């Protein structure tokens, strides 16, 4: 959805989508589908829409209810942004693989840097199943065969929970003692060094040297599990 709000002449005078083909319009979680067709880059492209020297072939969906397993212009994979040129006609294919059950109005589209979203026609496509079925396997150049929908997720949750709790520590090492009114009085009254004791003083050097240590080693241990 969303293109009925755009200026009419824009949509007429911008990119022309024709000969579209949708290889399904109901699909099950992990079953892929194919949108392919042609598009024309109208040589009378509007002033206030940058010529498409830097454009990207997206799809319009609310979140990755599909994943984009592939997309081609001219039989070249286009994961990065491309240069299109006014006047020319291109053919395209996008390989969508379903992920989240629902009734999805799938738009093929073209983001034009300095321009906006140029929105092609959408057809309802229905996914059935449970999204928990979704699996996104990849064979790495070291292979190793991973699932990219969960790979490294235990490492992020691990390391983030560690450093957060390491932080909460530091804050509770101190909020053990009284924090504000007594420390205030203490400082005003000329007695600020009384509040950082020598245990304090390098409990501090522990956390410091610890954090640097836990960094340098797990650093070195990462350039081993993934050389």
């Amino acid at each position: 959805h969303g293109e009925k709000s755009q200026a009419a002449f824009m949509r007429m005078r911008t990119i022309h989508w024709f000969d579209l083909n949708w290889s399904k319009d109901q699909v099950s979680v992990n079953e892929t589908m194919s949108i392919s067709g042609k598009f024309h880059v109208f040589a009378g492209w509007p002033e206030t829409v940058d010529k498409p020297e830097v454009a990207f072939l997206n799809i319009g969906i609310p979140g990755p209810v599909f994943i984009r397993a592939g997309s081609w212009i001219g039989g070249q994979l286009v994961p990065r942004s491309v240069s299109l040129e006014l006047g020319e006609t291109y053919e395209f294919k996008v390989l969508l693989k379903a992920r989240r059950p629902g009734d999805w109005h799938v738009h093929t589209m073209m983001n034009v840097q300095g321009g906006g979203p140029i929105i092609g026609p959408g057809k309802w496509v229905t996914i059935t199943g449970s999204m928990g079925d979704f699996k996104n396997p990849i064979t790495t150049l070291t292979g190793e065969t991973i699932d990219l929908e969960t790979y490294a997720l235990d490492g992020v949750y691990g390391w983030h929970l560690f450093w957060y709790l390491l932080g909460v520590a530091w804050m509770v090492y101190w909020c053990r003692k009284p924090v504000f009114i007594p420390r205030r009085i203490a400082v005003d009254a000329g007695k600020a060094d009384s509040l950082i004791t020598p245990t304090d003083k390098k409990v501090g050097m522990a956390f410091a040297a610890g954090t640097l240590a836990i960094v340098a080693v797990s650093m070195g241990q990462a350039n081993e599990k993934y050389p």
Binding site: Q113, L153, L166, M171, V179, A186
Partner: protein, 241 residues
């Protein structure tokens, strides 16, 4: 004399109910502030694994994030010998980021949490707090802390993202797994060219690109720290108008 309390014990119960209410307040208010600032300056690299590069992310995230710590240290340390200044901030950010990535990015728009996990700032926030508590000198904390804040940022994050930097021969083209995540989980409103990651130069040498960026981030981080300490002192001011 006359007393607000009716017993020494009451004076200690009250002076520590205030510790909670203020802790709660300065935690959440500075959360809101710090999180908004960080979302608009560094936030874009922080949302996606295929923006966490070696040139820009390594530069932007330290510089923008050292601000509020240097502000909060400025008041808390020198007015109260409080030494969890940087860490209250980085705690507040990550809590705010994480609630937003889990219940919203993944929660309501289904992005895999391993695509949208945040940056990790907490190593520098501890080395910063401590370097200030020891030494008790704004300048040494600016120079030695600023360099610390930048040089530590990529190490503190490389054990998390490195899995996603193993390459892949996908449909004919080399991509990292991070790149695969970006290609796969369709960002309808965030197309590829928006992403500001390193792309090479003819005046450049490749890796090393990360260490060179980390140091530059360290130097700018000391400048940002001087600035933001004085800004914090200004911010901690009891003057009336």
């Amino acid at each position: 004399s006359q007393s607000a309390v009716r017993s020494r014990a009451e004076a200690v119960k009250v002076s520590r109910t205030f510790d909670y209410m203020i802790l709660f307040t300065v935690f959440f208010v500075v959360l809101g502030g710090y999180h908004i600032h960080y979302m608009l300056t560094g936030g874009d690299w922080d949302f996606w694994t295929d923006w966490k590069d070696r040139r820009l992310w390594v530069t932007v995230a330290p510089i923008v994030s050292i601000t509020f710590p240097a502000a909060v240290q400025a008041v808390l340390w020198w007015r109260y010998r409080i030494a969890w200044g940087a860490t209250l901030c980085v705690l507040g950010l990550l809590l705010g980021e994480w609630i937003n990535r889990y219940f919203n990015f993944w929660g309501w728009t289904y992005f895999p949490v391993n695509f949208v996990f945040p940056s990790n700032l907490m190593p520098g926030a501890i080395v910063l707090d401590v370097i200030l508590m020891l030494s008790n000198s704004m300048t040494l904390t600016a120079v030695v802390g600023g360099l610390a804040w930048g040089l530590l940022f990529y190490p503190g994050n490389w054990p998390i993202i490195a899995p996603l930097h193993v390459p892949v021969e996908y449909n004919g083209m080399m991509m990292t797994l991070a790149d695969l995540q970006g290609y796969h989980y369709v960002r309808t409103g965030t197309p590829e060219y928006i992403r500001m990651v390193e792309k090479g130069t003819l005046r450049t040498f490749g890796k090393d690109v990360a260490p060179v960026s980390a140091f530059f981030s360290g130097f700018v981080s000391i400048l940002i720290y001087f600035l933001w300490h004085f800004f914090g002192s200004w911010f901690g001011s009891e003057k009336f108008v």
